Write an enzyme that holds these catalytic residues in place. Sequence first.
Site, short mmCIF file in Angstrom:
data_model
loop_
_atom_site.label_atom_id
_atom_site.label_comp_id
_atom_site.label_asym_id
_atom_site.label_seq_id
_atom_site.Cartn_x
_atom_site.Cartn_y
_atom_site.Cartn_z
N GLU A 148 0.79 -1.22 0.00
CA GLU A 148 0.00 0.00 0.00
C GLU A 148 0.84 1.30 0.00
OE1 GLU A 148 -2.61 0.53 3.20
OE2 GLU A 148 -4.10 1.51 1.88
N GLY A 282 3.09 1.38 11.05
CA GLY A 282 2.93 0.79 12.36
C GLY A 282 2.30 -0.57 12.21
N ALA A 283 1.46 -0.68 11.19
CA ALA A 283 0.84 -1.93 10.83
C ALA A 283 0.22 -1.85 9.43
CB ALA A 283 -0.23 -2.28 11.85
N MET A 284 0.08 -2.99 8.75
CA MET A 284 -0.59 -3.01 7.45
C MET A 284 -1.72 -4.07 7.36
SD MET A 284 -1.14 -2.03 4.56
CE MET A 284 -2.64 -2.67 3.87
N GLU A 285 -2.89 -3.63 6.90
CA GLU A 285 -4.15 -4.31 7.10
C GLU A 285 -4.44 -5.47 6.17
OE1 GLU A 285 -4.50 -0.85 5.78
OE2 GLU A 285 -6.16 -0.93 4.32
N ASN A 286 -3.44 -5.94 5.45
CA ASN A 286 -3.58 -7.13 4.60
C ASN A 286 -4.58 -8.21 4.98
OD1 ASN A 286 -1.49 -6.23 3.08
ND2 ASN A 286 -0.01 -7.24 4.41
N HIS A 318 -7.42 -0.99 15.10
CA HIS A 318 -7.43 -0.21 13.88
C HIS A 318 -7.37 -1.15 12.70
CE1 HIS A 318 -6.59 3.37 11.37
NE2 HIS A 318 -5.76 2.59 10.72
N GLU A 319 -6.42 -2.08 12.76
CA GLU A 319 -6.26 -3.07 11.73
C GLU A 319 -7.49 -3.90 11.50
OE1 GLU A 319 -3.13 -1.22 11.03
OE2 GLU A 319 -4.15 -2.63 9.78
N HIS A 322 -10.16 -2.53 9.56
CA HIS A 322 -9.88 -2.35 8.15
C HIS A 322 -10.37 -3.51 7.31
CE1 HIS A 322 -7.92 1.33 7.20
NE2 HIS A 322 -6.88 1.15 7.98
O1 LIG Z 1 -3.02 3.51 8.90
C1 LIG Z 1 -2.17 2.69 9.18
N1 LIG Z 1 -2.38 1.45 8.78
O2 LIG Z 1 -3.52 1.29 7.99
C2 LIG Z 1 -0.85 3.01 9.85
C3 LIG Z 1 0.09 3.76 8.89
C4 LIG Z 1 0.01 3.54 7.37
C5 LIG Z 1 0.52 4.57 6.57
C6 LIG Z 1 0.50 4.45 5.18
C7 LIG Z 1 -0.02 3.30 4.57
F1 LIG Z 1 -0.05 3.20 3.23
C8 LIG Z 1 -0.53 2.27 5.36
C9 LIG Z 1 -0.49 2.39 6.75
C10 LIG Z 1 -0.95 3.92 11.08
O3 LIG Z 1 -1.77 3.77 11.99
N2 LIG Z 1 -0.06 4.85 11.05
C11 LIG Z 1 0.25 5.96 11.95
C12 LIG Z 1 -0.11 7.23 11.18
C13 LIG Z 1 -0.62 8.35 11.85
C14 LIG Z 1 -0.98 9.50 11.16
C15 LIG Z 1 -0.83 9.54 9.79
C16 LIG Z 1 -0.33 8.42 9.12
C17 LIG Z 1 0.03 7.26 9.80
ZN LIG Z 2 -5.33 2.29 8.70
#
Ligand SMILES: O=C(NO)[C@@H](Cc1ccc(F)cc1)C(=O)NCc1ccccc1
Ligand SMILES: [Zn+2]
Length: 910
Positions: A148, A282-286, A318-319, A322
């Site tokens: 992503e 921090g994490a990816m929602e695969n 959060h994940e 998703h």
């Molecule tokens: O949304 C998230 N996982 O889905 C991750 C970050 C992420 C960034 C780009 C992607 F393509 C996928 C995941 C998260 O919580 N991140 C902390 C964060 C805080 C504020 C803005 C951006 C990221």
């Molecule tokens: Zn997210």
Amino acid sequence: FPVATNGERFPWQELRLPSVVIPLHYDLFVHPNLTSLDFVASEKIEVLVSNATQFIILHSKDLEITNATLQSEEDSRYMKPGKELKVLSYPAHEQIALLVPEKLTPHLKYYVAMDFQAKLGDGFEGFYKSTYRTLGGETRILAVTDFEPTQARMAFPCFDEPLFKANFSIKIRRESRHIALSNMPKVKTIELEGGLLEDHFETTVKMSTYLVAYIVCDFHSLSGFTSSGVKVSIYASPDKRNQTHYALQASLKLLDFYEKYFDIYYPLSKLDLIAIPDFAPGAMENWGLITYRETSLLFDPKTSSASDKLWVTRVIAHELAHQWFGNLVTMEWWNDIWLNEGFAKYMELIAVNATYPELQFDDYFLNVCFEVITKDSLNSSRPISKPAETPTQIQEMFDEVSYNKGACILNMLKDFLGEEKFQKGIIQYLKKFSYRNAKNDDLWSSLSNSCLESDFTSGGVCHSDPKMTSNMLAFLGENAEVKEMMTTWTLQKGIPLLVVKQDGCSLRLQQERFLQGVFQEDPEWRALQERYLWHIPLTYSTSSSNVIHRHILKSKTDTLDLPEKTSWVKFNVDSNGYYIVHYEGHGWDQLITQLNQNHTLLRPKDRVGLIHDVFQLVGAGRLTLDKALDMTYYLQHETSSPALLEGLSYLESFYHMMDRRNISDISENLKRYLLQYFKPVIDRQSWSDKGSVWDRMLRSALLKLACDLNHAPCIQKAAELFSQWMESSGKLNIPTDVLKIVYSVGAQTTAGWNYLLEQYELSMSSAEQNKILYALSTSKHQEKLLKLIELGMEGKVIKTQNLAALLHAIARRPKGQQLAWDFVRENWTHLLKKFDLGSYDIRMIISGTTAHFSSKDKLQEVKLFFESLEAQGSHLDIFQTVLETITKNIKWLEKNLPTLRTWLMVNTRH
Ligand SMILES: O=C(NO)[C@@H](Cc1ccc(F)cc1)C(=O)NCc1ccccc1
Ligand SMILES: [Zn+2]
Ligand SMILES: *[C@@H]1O[C@H](CO)[C@@H](O[C@@H]2O[C@H](CO)[C@@H](O[C@@H]3O[C@H](CO)[C@@H](O)[C@H](O)[C@@H]3O)[C@H](O)[C@H]2NC(C)=O)[C@H](O)[C@H]1NC(C)=O
Ligand SMILES: *[C@@H]1O[C@H](CO)[C@@H](O[C@@H]2O[C@H](CO)[C@@H](O)[C@H](O)[C@H]2NC(C)=O)[C@H](O)[C@H]1NC(C)=O
Ligand SMILES: *[C@@H]1O[C@H](CO)[C@@H](O[C@@H]2O[C@H](CO)[C@@H](O)[C@H](O)[C@H]2NC(C)=O)[C@H](O)[C@H]1NC(C)=O
Ligand SMILES: *[C@@H]1O[C@H](CO)[C@@H](O)[C@H](O)[C@H]1NC(C)=O
Ligand SMILES: *[C@@H]1O[C@H](CO)[C@@H](O)[C@H](O)[C@H]1NC(C)=O
Ligand SMILES: *[C@@H]1O[C@H](CO)[C@@H](O)[C@H](O)[C@H]1NC(C)=O
Ligand SMILES: *[C@@H]1O[C@H](CO)[C@@H](O)[C@H](O)[C@H]1NC(C)=O
Ligand SMILES: *[C@@H]1O[C@H](CO)[C@@H](O)[C@H](O)[C@H]1NC(C)=O
Ligand SMILES: *[C@@H]1O[C@H](CO)[C@@H](O)[C@H](O)[C@H]1NC(C)=O
């Protein structure tokens, strides 16, 4: 226009793929070799053409394409097997063309195969390499995907757009000492001649390419089953299996909640959660296989803190959210990425509350909203839905506007419509758009036209045959007005400022666009006020009634009329709304004396919202710093930790601000005020892990503040822990709520800082590591700070995934801001190696090293440096945002520094 890689006209002109060749299914076979650190691979794409064509357009990047072939079973010119294809590159769009011997046929299915190969990536994107330390000192390798937004194309060629959903069939060839994971469960394992193995996975459901995932590693797991029969596994490197217990519980319980509240079963036999040693986000929602930073997923009671437990619950929540908001329903394109990312953020609130209310995460949500207001109150902000096209412009779409604000806006709504109606609207949305896509309007029409009860046809409202009561007149009418409302919040940048004047039992309301560093009559001000208008659903309560009355703007002005007179008015109950309130006349005054006399007369979120807005208004020049600092006097009797901590954070931030600039006199009075006031609370504090979670969080904050201000008892108690710990060589246990404080004190001598850098490399708690690196970053010796940056660049002892956080750690301390800034400018080019541009890491590197500057001096250097980065073709949005922030700081000092010097002096006297 287009002229391709080796002469020759690329058929395609536009950046978005042609909407004429629709993929349907992917056969995908990957054979990575982790001693060669490369992979070869192959795929077959079942497409369906809609209009006849002689070229096929599809994404690819850094992929060496060996063969290329077109078969079919509905077109005779293409039956098994031939013919080979004309493949043509074009890196500047990451597109390739397939040039076909003869025009294809409308409504007929062809099959695109292709051999392609590449090296394992070496930086957080696509199919890449990662390494970890065992308990023994061993160092192992794994291979991970992160795709992503648009890095699927670096891993296998495809139609990389979230709209082009498709089934995925996946096969991974591996050695016996490795397992392999992908989105789906493993159907079959076939033993092979040389002795390799080849794994097959159930064909996935319809899904976007950015969510595809495969890992190859030697990890372990703990497993458990859902109420609804989903197998859930937490994977982690083997000597860490026992930090996966909390994740197992939390996920199970959270996935069980999500199925209930969404009323849609998670659709897949299994759900894997894996903690990856080198992971950028921090994490990816695969779908089926979620990846995490070790610090986002693992947890260890002896060494993780309760805020850590709250962070791990948050990120897991959060994940798993998703899996519906993103995987099951996906945004039509990256302009509405917030339909993904806003909802997941907000559903943290709901699901953590529902499943873990002893975590108090309900309080802490207001912080999400206050953080985004910062950026949203500058002109370099954006609407939550704006267009997007470059890979860089798409990455940029991932910020606190699409995350936090979307969550906040949505929370507003939940209050307006009530849980029962909100929840009903969501369940519709998801059901309707399952396995396909939505754009913004879809989300509202659904949330608008949400349904109750259902009341069973016989009355009515929602069915094929409902009656036509004098309720149905407004059901279709009010619901249609809710949609007209939100469209304001999604298309208009910024946040509204409500002005409330209380002359008589009538209330005059004005509406503006709230701006920071811009008084009601600068030259700047009127232009920025131009076209802006919101549909602000307001609330209020009075002293004469703790009843919640509701009313909706309307245009620039309006007037309400109370029952009775009253001491004060208090708009935005619990600040569940996305607006700043300003009270004219005596408003602030009554409200303030109300805090000092009987503050319990105000709701505790009302108190948090008031503290927040009063200081924010000082910044907008509608209030003077003295009225705001005055309102902190009440904090000395305050018992809700949200309100105490928020207030303390403004004082603590002024101090740090004054400290940077060497303003010793204000720095030292501020220190004195904080310690003499608040001395009762600072001292009711155990150096323990006892108490609830806001209790634990208060203790950490207050014990930090004391040690930050060199309050010698607190410094002595800390060091007297660090000593016992370093002698016992780790056998003694330091409570987790004070770990960072003790380490930080301990790191002030070279004996300490050394011992700690040592323990860093040995630690199996990635959370303890987190705390140690903070403590290390607080040494005064600039030699040591620079060693830390060096180490973090190498990436061996200190992972580079940690480097942005550490430059920010160093930069915000006085003895490290120059070093950080010098380093970023002298190593920019090297940093663009290591990271995208693009990346979260670059944005935190830029703004964590400059955004706290507050002098026209520093503003000068930063403004050049950005402009130097311009030309080289490096444009980010964080450039203006930062400069607009530096300036806001400068104006703030100009307009309020004296008033802070004086307020303190006055206080000393009294
Ligand atoms: O949304 C998230 N996982 O889905 C991750 C970050 C992420 C960034 C780009 C992607 F393509 C996928 C995941 C998260 O919580 N991140 C902390 C964060 C805080 C504020 C803005 C951006 C990221
Ligand atoms: Zn997210
Ligand atoms: C690609 O993914 C789609 C879904 O996005 C798959 O469609 C699903 O599979 C079949 C349709 O062929 C349906 O199966 C149903 O399952 C129950 C048992 O659980 C069975 O008894 C029913 O009679 C029914 O056949 C299912 O409803 C359907 N779901 C959706 C949402 O379309 C499709 O199979 C995938 N394609 C490939 C090639 O795997
Ligand atoms: C990856 O490649 C390496 C070598 O490039 C393979 O390791 C060799 O495998 C053969 C037969 O499988 C053995 O006879 C050799 O002893 C191995 N070499 C070493 C140095 O041990 C490995 O099997 C390949 N793995 C995959 C999954 O392709
Ligand atoms: C967080 O959860 C709490 C409780 O689970 C919700 O608070 C309310 O609890 C009272 C019990 O007396 C009831 O009115 C309802 O169970 C809840 N209120 C409503 C209006 O349903 C609270 O709503 C939750 N927070 C969020 C944001 O959903
Ligand atoms: C594709 O076909 C449709 C009608 O089936 C029509 O829009 C036109 O002929 C073609 N449009 C494009 C953009 O190729
Ligand atoms: C790839 O091309 C080579 C070249 O002769 C051929 O031998 C091989 O069969 C092809 N493989 C595939 C999968 O197309
Ligand atoms: C690790 O696993 C062991 C069992 O091997 C267990 O006794 C212990 O509580 C777990 N936690 C830690 C921090 O070792
Ligand atoms: C405010 O933002 C708009 C939109 O980006 C821009 O056109 C305008 O120049 C900005 N004005 C200032 C003073 O920043
Ligand atoms: C605050 O108001 C409540 C409501 O009557 C009362 O019980 C409490 O004693 C009051 N406290 C003070 C200090 O006025
Ligand atoms: C603060 O200013 C004084 C003024 O002479 C100077 O001597 C001192 O070194 C400065 N301290 C820092 C940390 O810059």
